Amino acid sequence: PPPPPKKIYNYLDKYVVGQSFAKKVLSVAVYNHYKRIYNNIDIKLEKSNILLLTGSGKTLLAQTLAVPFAICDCGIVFLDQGEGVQQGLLKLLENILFVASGAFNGLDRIKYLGFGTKDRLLRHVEARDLIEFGMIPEFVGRLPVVVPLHSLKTLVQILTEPQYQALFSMDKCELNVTEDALKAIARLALERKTGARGLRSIMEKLLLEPMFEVPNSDIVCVEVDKEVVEKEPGYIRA
Amino acid sequence: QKPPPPPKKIYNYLDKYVVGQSFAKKVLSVAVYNHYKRIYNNIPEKRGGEVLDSSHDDIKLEKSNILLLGPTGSGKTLLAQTLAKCLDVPFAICDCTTLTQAGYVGEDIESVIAKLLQDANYNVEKAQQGIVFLDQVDKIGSVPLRDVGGEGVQQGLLKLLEGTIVNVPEKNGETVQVDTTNILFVASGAFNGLDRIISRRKNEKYLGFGTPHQDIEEKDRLLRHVEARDLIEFGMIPEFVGRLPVVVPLHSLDEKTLVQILTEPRNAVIPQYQALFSMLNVTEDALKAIARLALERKTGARGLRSIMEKLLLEPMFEVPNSDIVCVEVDKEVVEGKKEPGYI
Amino acid sequence: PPPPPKKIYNYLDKYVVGQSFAKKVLSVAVYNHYKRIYNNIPEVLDSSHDDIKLEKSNILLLGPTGSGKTLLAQTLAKCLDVPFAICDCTTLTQAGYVGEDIESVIAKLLQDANYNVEKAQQGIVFLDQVDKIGSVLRDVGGEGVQQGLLKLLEGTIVNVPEKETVQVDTTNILFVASGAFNGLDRIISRRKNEKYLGFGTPSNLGHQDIEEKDRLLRHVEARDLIEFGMIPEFVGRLPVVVPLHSLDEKTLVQILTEPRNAVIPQYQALFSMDKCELNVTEDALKAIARLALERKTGARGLRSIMEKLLLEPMFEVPNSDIVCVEVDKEVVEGKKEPGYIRA
Amino acid sequence: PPPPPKKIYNYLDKYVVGQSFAKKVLSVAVYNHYKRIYNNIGEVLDSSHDDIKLEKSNILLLGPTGSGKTLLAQTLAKCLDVPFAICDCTTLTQAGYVGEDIESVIAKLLQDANYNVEKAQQGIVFLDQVDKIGSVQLRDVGGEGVQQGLLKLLEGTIVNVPEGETVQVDTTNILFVASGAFNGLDRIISRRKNEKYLGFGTPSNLGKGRRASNTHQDIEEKDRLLRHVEARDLIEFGMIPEFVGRLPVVVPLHSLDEKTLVQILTEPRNAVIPQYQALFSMDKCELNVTEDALKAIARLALERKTGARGLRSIMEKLLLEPMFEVPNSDIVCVEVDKEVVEGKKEPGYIRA
Amino acid sequence: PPPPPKKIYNYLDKYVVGQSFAKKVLSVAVYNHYKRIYNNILDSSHDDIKLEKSNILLLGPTGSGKTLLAQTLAKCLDVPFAICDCTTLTQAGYVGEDIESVIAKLLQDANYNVEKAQQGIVFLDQVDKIGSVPQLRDVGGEGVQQGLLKLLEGTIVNVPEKNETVQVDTTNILFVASGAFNGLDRIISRRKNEKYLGFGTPSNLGKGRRASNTHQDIEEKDRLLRHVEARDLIEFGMIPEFVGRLPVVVPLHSLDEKTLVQILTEPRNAVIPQYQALFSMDKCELNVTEDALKAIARLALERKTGARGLRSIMEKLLLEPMFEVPNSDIVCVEVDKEVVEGKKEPGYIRA
Amino acid sequence: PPPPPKKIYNYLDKYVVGQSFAKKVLSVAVYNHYKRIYNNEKSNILLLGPTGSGKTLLAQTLAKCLDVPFAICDCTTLTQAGYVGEDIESVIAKLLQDANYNVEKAQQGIVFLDQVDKIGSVPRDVGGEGVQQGLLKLLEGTIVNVPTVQVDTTNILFVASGAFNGLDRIISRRKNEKYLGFGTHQDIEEKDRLLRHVEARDLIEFGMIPEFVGRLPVVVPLHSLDEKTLVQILTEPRNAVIPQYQALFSMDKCELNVTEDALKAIARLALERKTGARGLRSIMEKLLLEPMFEVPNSDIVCVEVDKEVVEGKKEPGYIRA
Ligand SMILES: Nc1ncnc2c1ncn2[C@@H]1O[C@H](COP(=O)(O)OP(=O)(O)OP(=O)(O)O)[C@@H](O)[C@H]1O
Ligand SMILES: Nc1ncnc2c1ncn2[C@@H]1O[C@H](COP(=O)(O)OP(=O)(O)OP(=O)(O)O)[C@@H](O)[C@H]1O
Ligand SMILES: Nc1ncnc2c1ncn2[C@@H]1O[C@H](COP(=O)(O)OP(=O)(O)O)[C@@H](O)[C@H]1O
Ligand SMILES: [Mg+2]
Ligand SMILES: [Mg+2]
Ligand SMILES: [Mg+2]
Ligand SMILES: [Mg+2]
C-alpha cells in the first residue's frame, strides 16, 4: 500500500523547497487514488485528478511524487494545459491518475459605486472561474482538485542539484561569490520575472568577461565578486 | 435495435440522479420513449415511375426535437446525459456560442456530427441514432453587416435538425456519410430576459404604481407559460423555432434541494467522503449551512464539491493516525469559527 | 412514354394538400424534362439547317415556412426515374475559402447515380435555402456563391472528384431552387403602390395581412428578385417563378386528417403500438388548427400542439389497463383532462 | 486558304441577331490567327538579322446579361479548325490555395488537342466571367491574385501543364478571348466623361445644344455609354493595369432592343418559339403564335431587364396551362392571340 | 574576350527605344559578370580578393520595356540563363512549384552541365507580386521572399535530377528581378513629405511655374520613380533581407509621345512593319503617312498601358480594311491624319 | 589544446569589424565546447540583430577556424515529418557528411541554424511551430537515425541566428508605458538600446514556442553598424568593398582612387537606406556606373572620386594616357 500523506509530504520536502501548502494538498490527493486500488485488490468513488495551477517546479513535484511517472506537454501521467482536443482528452480522463499543469489570469471572482459604511487570486479558485477562462465544464468536472503553486526568494539561493566553479576548476582557477550579496544576483531573476529558469542565463552573463580573461596567459588565482551585479569583478593574481 | 423502456421506468432512472425537476423529467421521459419507439416503427416499387401507382404505403413517423429552458446550474445538461445513459445512445455536446457561418473563422456547424461519430466509436449506425445536445442556443439569437454566429448559425442548423447527409472524416480526405434524419436534437438555453417577454405578452404589470411567496419562483411560474409566439420575439428565427416542437421549463434549485443534492443523488458528494474507512459525521445544520454558503457564494450545485473538499483537507491528512476513529463536522465548523472534531 | 403531367399531379396531390399551382408547374416541368432528354440525346461548316436542340428552364419555388416547399421536393423525388440530389446552399462558399465547393452539388448527384456519368447528366438538383445566398472584403458566402453557380445553371463541363476527377456536363441537368425570401412581399408592395412624389403636372397635380401577403407575392417578377439581392445574371436563368401560398385553418384541419402521413394518423400509430385507440372528435380538429395558426410556423404548428395535449396519455397509457383515449374540444381548450376508457 | 472574314461572319449571322461589330471583330480575329500561325509556324551581336514575328491581339467582349457574349463564343468554337478550350474564371485561385490551378486552362486545351502539343500551342482559349476576377487586409486569392497569375498566359510563356508528369506548352501563339458583363462599368465611364460634376466648372464645354418607354431610355443610355469604354475605365473597375494592357481589343456588345427581341423569337437557329412548337410536335399538337402576339411577348420580355432570357420566362408562363392540358386531350392546335398574351383570354384550343 | 559594354549596348539599342540608363546598367553588369567569373572561378595570407555579385532590380511601369530588355539580353548571353515567373512559386511544403525550380530550369538550359549552370544568369519576372500583404502564413507572398534569400546570397542547393538530386552553388549565379510595383509612386511622394499637413519652414522648389493633361501624370510618375530608394521597397511589402541583396535598382521611365512615334517605325519587329506584313499576305499595301503616326501616338499615350497601347489603336483603325480587303480587288490601303481622327474612312485604291 | 578565446577573438577581428561583444561570447562558447569535449551542460546560442550586421559573417568566419565538424542550414527548407520538403533530421545528416561520416567525431559538431525567425509561429503549419516542435528533439539530446547510423545530439552545440524584424517593437510595448499627466542615427540607436533588453518572454511573443526559447539560454544581440564602422568596413577588413572595385578596374589596367573624404561621404549615404553593410555596395555601383561603362577598351588610365563626385556635384574625374 501507499505511505501516509504525511510521509509523502516529507519526501516531497526532500526535493521541493517551497510550496508546503501545495505539497500538502497534493499529498492528500494522490494518496486517495492509490488507496482505492488496495481496496479493490454508496457507489464507489469517482477518479480524482489534479490541476496544478510559470517556470515553477510543478513538474518536479509530480516527479518527486513518483510508478511510471510518465509526463508530456501540449500508474500515473502528467500533462500541460482546442475545445475539440479537450473533449477528446475528456474521453480518456474518465485508466490512470493524471495531472494537468497550467497558468492563467483573471481567475478572481471580480466594488461599491457610492457611499457606504497571488494568494487573493488563486486560493479562491472556482469552477465557475475556470469556465470563464474557457475550459469545458465537463472537463473541469474531471479535474475536481485545483492546487495553487507558490510564486518563488531564499529558495532560489537554497535550491541545490554557483555550480560553475567546476568549469574554472578545470581552468586551474578558483571561483567564489559573496553570499551576502548573492541575494541580489538571485533578486535579478525576481525582477526579470524569469522564474527559476533565468539562473543559467544570468550566470552566463556575469561570468562572461571572467571566462574570457581567466583561461590562459593570465593569473590562476581565485576570481571574486561582491555586489558586482549591482562596480567591476575582482581577482587575486598569482 | 431494442425495445425502449416505458416512460415510468425512465422517470425512475432520472429520479436517481436529478433532484426535484419532476415536470422536466416527465416530459423528457415521454419524448425520449416516443423517439426511439418510432425509429423502431419506420425501420427498413420503392423508387421510380412505379411509385405513381402505389396504392398504399406505411405511415412514416417523424421526429420531435426538444428545447430545454432554464437557469444555469439547474441540471439541463445533467438531464440529457442521464437520458443518453438510460439508453446507451451516443451523446454529443455542442457549444453554439463557438459556431459561425461557413467561410468564417469560427467552428463549422457540422463538427458536432464528427464528435457524435467519435462518441459512437465510428459505429455509424449507432452514431445515426444519437442525441445531440446543442448548448447555449439562446446566444445565437438574432440581434435587434453579416450576422455570422447569430442568425447565420440559426439558418445553418435548419437542415441539420431536419434530416440531411453530412460528410465526416474517418479515424484514419476519405469520409463517411452520417444521416441526421434520426438523430434527436436537444437544444438548451437560459433565455435570459424571456420572462419579460412572457409577462408583457400575458398582460402582467412590472412597472409603475401597483405592480403586485417565494423569492425567484415568480420567474419559474412565468417561464412555465413560454410559447413559440415569444421565442420568436426573443430573436429566434421562425424556421428554427418550428423545428423544436417540444419545450421544457426547468426551475431554479432551492437550498431545500441543494441539501438534497448533498445526500440523495447516486453521485452525491457526501456519501463519497463518508464512505472512507475509519470515518464522517456531518450535522444536519451543517448541510443547511453548506447549502446556504453555496447560494451566498452564488455557485450552483457544481460548487458543492469545491466547498466540501476545502473543509475536509485537514482531516484527510491527519486521518491515517489511528487515534482518529471519527471525524465530525458541525454548523460552526462550516462557518470556519471552529476546528473539526477529532475523536 | 413518360407519364403525363396530369398523372404526376395526381401523385403529388396525395401528400401535399394545397398549392395546386406549384403541383401543376412541377408536373409539367418533369414531363418536359423527359421530352427534352430524349430530344437532346440520341471543323469548317455549311448547312441549310441543324436539328433543333431543346434548352431547359430551371424553376424557383417561393413561400413561407411550413408551406410545403421541401415536401414538394421530397415527394417528387420519389417518383423520378432519373437521379436526383437535394442539397443546401448554406454550406457553399466561393473557391479558395473554407466551406463546401459548389461542385459538391454535382458530386452528390454523381454518387446518387451510382457513378454512371451518362445517367447523372440527366438528373434533377433541388437547391434549398437559395434566399440565403442573396447579396448584402468579398461576400464569400453570398454573392460569391451566386456568381459561381452561373455556369452550373447554364451548363458547363464540371470536374467532379469521385470514388483523378470525372467530367460531368451539366447542360441537361435541371435545377430547382427554393427559398422563403422573407421580406420580398414588402419589395413587391413598394413596386406597385408607390406613385409620383411631388406636384406632378398641369393635370392632376396636388389574418387579412396574411391574405395580402399571399395576394401580393403572386405578382413577384424578376425586378423584385434583383432588388432582393439576387444578381441579374442569376435571376435571368431561373425563368420559372412559382409562389406557394400560406395555409389556412381550412387546410390545417385538412392536413390533420386528409393527406398521406397526416399528423394525427402518426400519433394513432404510436398509440396503436401500445394497443390503444386515440379518438379526436371533429370539433377538436377545428380547435387544434385554430391554435396552430398562432404558433406562426405553418403546418409545423400542428405537432407542437399534439405533443402538448397527449403528454399525459402518452405517459399513463404504456402497460396500463387503458384501451382508448378520447380528445374533445374541452380537452383542447385546456379545461378538462382527456377521457380514459379502461378494459 | 483559311476562310475569309466574310464567310465566318455569315456563319455567326445565322445564330446571333444584331451585334454586327462583334461578329466582324471575331471573324477578322480568327482569320488573323490562321495568318499568324502559318507565318509563325550561341551569342553573336553583329552581322545578323531576324524576320518579323507577328504577334497576337487578345480580345475582350463586354456587354449586358443575355446579349450574346457566350452565344458568340460557343457558335464560333463550332467553326474553328484549331483546338479550343472554354472555361470559367470563377473556378481559379492563386497558387498554393484550394481550387483549380490557372494552368488547368491549358491542360483542358491540351486534352482537346488529343495531347498533340504542337497543335495545342495554336489553340484559342475563351475566358468567361472575367469581370468576377475584379480586384476589391487579406490576400485576394481569387480575383486580383488570379489576374496577376494570368499575366504569364496572355503573353508568351512556357507552362508546365501536368498530364515527370508535366508537358511543357509554349503559350505564345495561343489566342485568348475574354468575356464579362462588367456590371456597373457605365457608371464609371460617365463619371470619366465629366457627366457627373460639382461646382461651376466655368471653363468646361457649353453643352447648350439644340435640345440635345422608360426602359428604352435606360437601355439607350447604357448602350450609348459603353461605346466609349476605354482601358482607363477597366482599370477603375478593378482590372490590373498589366492585365488590361494585354487585352488590346475591347468589344462592347449592345443591349437587345425590342425590335431585335421580335427577331430572336422567330429568326435565328434554335429560336425560342421553334423550340416550343417542337415540344408540341411530340404531343401531335400545333402551336400558332401570331405576329401581333410576338410584339407583345417581346414588349413584356424587355421589362424583365434580363435580355433574351426574358423571352423564355414569358413563354413558360403563357403555355403552362396548354402544356398541362394538351398531352392527352385530343387537342389539334393551340392558338395564341395578342389578347392571350395580355391575359384577357385563355389560349384557344381546336378539338380533333 | 568578353564583349565590352558598349557592344552589348549597341545590340540592345536595336530592339529597345529610349531606355539608355537600363541599357547601360545591364551592359555593365553583364560585362562585370564575365569579368568576375574569369577571376572568381591562426592568420592566413596570400589569398586573392573574391568579387561578390551585385544583383539587379528593374522597376519601371507597364509596357516600358522591362521584359523586352530581359528577353533581348538573353540573346547576348554566352552563359546559361533561365527566365521564370515569381507567381508560380510557393514556400516549401505547400502545393505549387518550389523555389528550387528556378535553379532546375537553369540546369536544364545548361544541359545539366553543373559547372556551366553554376555561373548562369536568372531573370525573376513579376517580383512585385510576391510583396507581402499590409500575421498571415503568406504561402505565395512573403513566404516566397523568405525562401529566395538563400538563393540570392550564395548557398548550396539540391535540385532534382532529370532521371535523385545534384548539388549546385548559387554563389556566382546572377539574379535579375523586375516588376511594375504599382503604387510605389504614392509611397515615394509620401516619403518626400509631399502629403504633409500644416505649415513648415523648409521649401525645396518653386513648384508650378509651367503652362496634354495625361502627359503631366506621366511626367510626375517618372519624376518620383527616379528617386526610388530602399526605404520605399520595404514600405511596399518587400522584406529588408530581400531588398538588401538586390543592390542595383534601375527605374525605367514611361514613354513620351516622342518615343511612341519612334517605336512604331524604328525598332526590329516594329508595330507598323508587322501590320503591313499582314496586308502583304492579302497582296495589299498599307500606307500610313508620317503625320498619322503622331496622331496614333497621342491616342496611345492616353491609354495608360504603355507601348502595348499602340496596337490597341491599330486594331481599332484597321478593322474595316482587314474585313473588306482579304478577298477583294483592293490593292492598297491609305491612312492619314484625318482617318486616325475618325473624320474619314480609310482610302481604298482599287485594282 | 583548445585555442584560448582571445586567440579566436583575434581571428574574428580579421574579418568582422563591429560587434566586439558577440565576438567574446562566441570565442568563450567555442572554448567551452572544446573544454566540454573531455571529462564531460551546454548552452545553445541565439544571434539576434539587424540585417547586414554580421550574423552570418560571424558564423561563416568562425567555421574557418573550427576543428569540430560543422553544418550550415536554413530553417526555411524544413517541414513537418511526412510533408514534401527537407526533413528536420537532415540538419544532422549534413553534419554527418562533414568529417566523412565519422559518427564518433560528428557527435561533437557545431550546427548553425540560420533564419530561425522564419519558422516563427503565426496566430496545421507545415513550417512554423510544426518545425520548432521537431528541433526540440535535437536541441535536447536524442539518438537520431541518419542515412543508416544513430547519432546522439547530446553533445552537439547549436548556434541560431535570425533578424527577428519587428522584435524591437514587441520589446517597446513591454519596456515602456504611455503615461499622461504633469508628473538617421537617432532612429537607429533607439533600436540598438531597446534590442539590448530583449528577454525570453519577448521571443515567445514573436512566436517561438516556450520550450524552444528555453533551449537557447544565451541571446546575443548584434548592434547596428554606425557610420564610423561603415567607413572602416570600406577600407579595413579582408575582402573590403573598395579593394574589390579596385580589382575590377585594375584588370582593365585602370587605377581607381577614392579620397578619404569620399569614404566618409559614402558611409553617410549607406547609413540612410538601413540595409546594413550591403548598403555600401548599392552606392558604389550607383556611383561607378559611368566610369565602368566608359573605361573598358579605352585610353583612360585612372578614375578619381572625391566628395564632390559622391555628392553628385561633379562627374567622376578621368585621367588619360
Ligand atoms: N521601350 C520599348 N521599345 C520598343 N518596344 C517596346 C518598348 N516597350 C515596350 N515595347 C513593346 O511592347 C511589348 C511589351 O513590352 P514589355 O514586355 O517589355 O513590357 P513590360 O514593361 O515588361 O510589361 P509588364 O509590366 O506588363 O510585364 C514589346 O514586346 C514591344 O513590342
Ligand atoms: N561587421 C561587419 N564587418 C565586415 N563586413 C561586414 C559586416 N557586416 C556585414 N558585412 C558585409 O556585409 C555582408 C552582409 O552581412 P552578413 O553576411 O553577416 O549578413 P547578416 O547580417 O547575417 O544578414 P541577413 O539577415 O541578411 O542574413 C557580409 O557578408 C559582409 O560582406
Ligand atoms: N437537479 C440536480 N440534481 C443533481 N445534481 C445537479 C442538479 N443540478 C445541477 N447538478 C450538478 O451541477 C452540475 C453542472 O451541471 P448542470 O447544472 O446540468 O449544467 P447547466 O448549468 O448547463 O444546467 C452537474 O454535473 C451536477 O453535478
Ligand atoms: Mg423546407
Ligand atoms: Mg454568357
Ligand atoms: Mg513585362
Ligand atoms: Mg546573414
XYZ file of N, CA, C and O in Angstrom, chain C residues 293-343:
204
model
N -52.400 28.208 -35.961
C -52.061 29.465 -36.624
C -51.283 30.412 -35.724
O -50.367 31.097 -36.194
N -51.623 30.488 -34.444
C -50.899 31.407 -33.574
C -49.521 30.896 -33.172
O -48.798 31.608 -32.471
N -49.127 29.700 -33.606
C -47.730 29.306 -33.498
C -46.852 29.994 -34.532
O -45.632 30.041 -34.350
N -47.438 30.506 -35.614
C -46.735 31.299 -36.620
C -45.665 30.506 -37.365
O -44.710 31.085 -37.884
N -45.791 29.179 -37.431
C -44.769 28.335 -38.040
C -45.360 27.363 -39.054
O -44.767 26.312 -39.306
N -46.512 27.688 -39.637
C -47.111 26.836 -40.645
C -47.573 25.496 -40.099
O -47.959 25.360 -38.938
N -47.558 24.492 -40.973
C -48.011 23.157 -40.607
C -47.168 22.494 -39.528
O -47.580 21.455 -39.007
N -45.998 23.035 -39.194
C -45.263 22.548 -38.032
C -45.924 22.916 -36.713
O -45.564 22.350 -35.678
N -46.860 23.860 -36.720
C -47.605 24.163 -35.511
C -48.432 22.988 -35.028
O -48.618 22.801 -33.826
N -48.979 22.213 -35.963
C -49.919 21.152 -35.622
C -49.321 20.131 -34.660
O -49.993 19.695 -33.722
N -48.071 19.724 -34.879
C -47.460 18.733 -33.995
C -46.976 19.329 -32.681
O -46.838 18.600 -31.695
N -46.688 20.626 -32.644
C -46.363 21.258 -31.374
C -47.537 21.246 -30.408
O -47.333 21.149 -29.194
N -48.762 21.370 -30.913
C -49.939 21.238 -30.061
C -50.179 19.785 -29.673
O -50.408 19.472 -28.501
N -50.153 18.881 -30.651
C -50.382 17.466 -30.373
C -49.401 16.906 -29.351
O -49.781 16.086 -28.510
N -48.136 17.319 -29.410
C -47.171 16.888 -28.402
C -47.462 17.449 -27.016
O -47.040 16.851 -26.023
N -48.177 18.571 -26.922
C -48.556 19.123 -25.626
C -49.826 18.491 -25.064
O -49.917 18.256 -23.856
N -50.818 18.221 -25.914
C -52.056 17.594 -25.455
C -51.830 16.172 -24.970
O -52.274 15.801 -23.880
N -51.146 15.358 -25.761
C -51.065 13.929 -25.496
C -50.017 13.559 -24.457
O -49.834 12.367 -24.196
N -49.283 14.529 -23.908
C -48.226 14.219 -22.948
C -48.722 13.337 -21.810
O -48.079 12.347 -21.451
N -49.881 13.673 -21.239
C -50.410 12.859 -20.146
C -50.850 11.475 -20.606
O -50.413 10.483 -19.995
N -51.711 11.318 -21.619
C -51.965 9.967 -22.140
C -50.717 9.173 -22.487
O -50.628 7.995 -22.134
N -49.738 9.789 -23.150
C -48.538 9.062 -23.554
C -47.675 8.626 -22.379
O -46.898 7.679 -22.522
N -47.794 9.281 -21.225
C -47.104 8.807 -20.030
C -47.898 7.736 -19.290
O -47.310 6.795 -18.747
N -49.224 7.852 -19.263
C -50.054 6.945 -18.479
C -50.463 5.671 -19.208
O -50.663 4.642 -18.557
N -50.583 5.700 -20.531
C -51.067 4.560 -21.315
C -50.135 3.349 -21.358
O -50.625 2.219 -21.215
N -48.825 3.497 -21.564
C -47.967 2.310 -21.702
C -48.080 1.338 -20.537
O -47.950 1.716 -19.370
N -48.330 0.069 -20.871
C -48.512 -1.027 -19.917
C -49.678 -0.809 -18.955
O -49.765 -1.482 -17.925
N -50.581 0.115 -19.254
C -51.731 0.343 -18.397
C -52.924 -0.474 -18.885
O -52.888 -1.114 -19.937
N -53.989 -0.461 -18.089
C -55.247 -1.090 -18.470
C -56.076 -0.229 -19.415
O -57.225 -0.583 -19.699
N -55.525 0.884 -19.901
C -56.266 1.767 -20.793
C -56.391 1.114 -22.162
O -55.434 0.525 -22.684
N -57.579 1.228 -22.754
C -57.843 0.699 -24.080
C -58.108 1.790 -25.113
O -57.854 1.567 -26.301
N -58.626 2.949 -24.709
C -58.826 4.039 -25.650
C -58.678 5.375 -24.940
O -58.930 5.491 -23.739
N -58.275 6.385 -25.708
C -58.064 7.743 -25.220
C -58.890 8.676 -26.088
O -58.853 8.571 -27.319
N -59.629 9.586 -25.460
C -60.591 10.415 -26.168
C -60.293 11.889 -25.944
O -60.203 12.344 -24.801
N -60.157 12.631 -27.042
C -59.827 14.049 -27.017
C -61.015 14.811 -27.587
O -61.512 14.472 -28.666
N -61.471 15.831 -26.865
C -62.611 16.637 -27.274
C -62.281 18.113 -27.108
O -61.256 18.480 -26.532
N -63.163 18.960 -27.646
C -62.930 20.402 -27.642
C -62.598 20.928 -26.252
O -61.807 21.867 -26.108
N -63.212 20.356 -25.217
C -62.882 20.750 -23.851
C -61.437 20.417 -23.508
O -60.772 21.170 -22.789
N -60.933 19.289 -24.012
C -59.553 18.907 -23.740
C -58.584 19.842 -24.450
O -57.591 20.287 -23.866
N -58.857 20.152 -25.717
C -58.050 21.121 -26.453
C -58.088 22.491 -25.788
O -57.071 23.190 -25.718
N -59.256 22.904 -25.301
C -59.364 24.185 -24.613
C -58.644 24.214 -23.272
O -58.588 25.281 -22.652
N -58.093 23.095 -22.813
C -57.304 23.082 -21.595
C -58.088 23.115 -20.306
O -57.519 23.423 -19.255
N -59.382 22.810 -20.351
C -60.255 22.879 -19.188
C -60.774 21.506 -18.785
O -61.695 21.414 -17.968
N -60.217 20.439 -19.351
C -60.547 19.087 -18.935
C -59.363 18.174 -19.205
O -58.535 18.446 -20.075
N -59.284 17.104 -18.440
C -58.382 16.011 -18.745
C -58.947 15.139 -19.863
O -60.166 15.001 -19.996
N -58.082 14.545 -20.680
C -58.559 13.580 -21.677
C -59.193 12.359 -21.029
O -58.705 11.836 -20.027
N -60.294 11.908 -21.622
C -61.010 10.765 -21.086
C -60.255 9.468 -21.326
O -59.721 9.224 -22.408
N -60.207 8.631 -20.296
C -59.604 7.310 -20.389
C -60.698 6.254 -20.340
O -61.537 6.268 -19.434
N -60.703 5.351 -21.315
C -61.577 4.185 -21.301
C -60.712 2.977 -20.977
O -59.676 2.762 -21.616
N -61.138 2.181 -20.000
C -60.318 1.093 -19.496
C -60.991 -0.252 -19.720
O -62.220 -0.356 -19.753
N -60.164 -1.282 -19.860
C -60.636 -2.642 -20.084
C -61.515 -3.118 -18.930
O -61.035 -3.772 -18.002
